[PDB]
Amino acid sequence: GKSTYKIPDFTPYLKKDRNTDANRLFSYFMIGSFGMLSAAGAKATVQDFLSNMSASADVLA
């Protein structure tokens, strides 16, 4: 309400183990999983999509 050195209450959101490597590693596991599926999805997308350019079934015949 007045003092700016009295930091507002963040206890509802602060993690107790916040400076552990375990803690950071978890969030990077989420980011990395997301990167992993995006990489797997992009590979699948590109490979399937560009295969249209390979000889079609009538040509192969």
Binding site: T20, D21, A22, R24, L25, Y28, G32, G35, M36, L37, A39, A40, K43, A44
Partner: protein
């Protein structure tokens, strides 16, 4: 756990290498897993199931 972070995550070059190697493994295993699952839920329906008659 610090060890895991230090090896696979701390350097971005390592993290991206880990992600791409994981993507490779996921892609290969997921393909195989879906293939088997798809064959079980569609059992006796697919060509591979009736081909033996011919």
């Amino acid at each position: 756990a610090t060890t895991f972070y230090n090896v696979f995550v701390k350097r971005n070059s390592a993290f991206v290498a880990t992600i791409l190697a994981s993507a490779f493994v996921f892609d290969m295993t997921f393909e195989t897993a879906i293939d088997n699952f798809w064959d079980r839920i569609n059992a006796g329906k697919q060509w591979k199931d009736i081909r033996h008659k011919y």
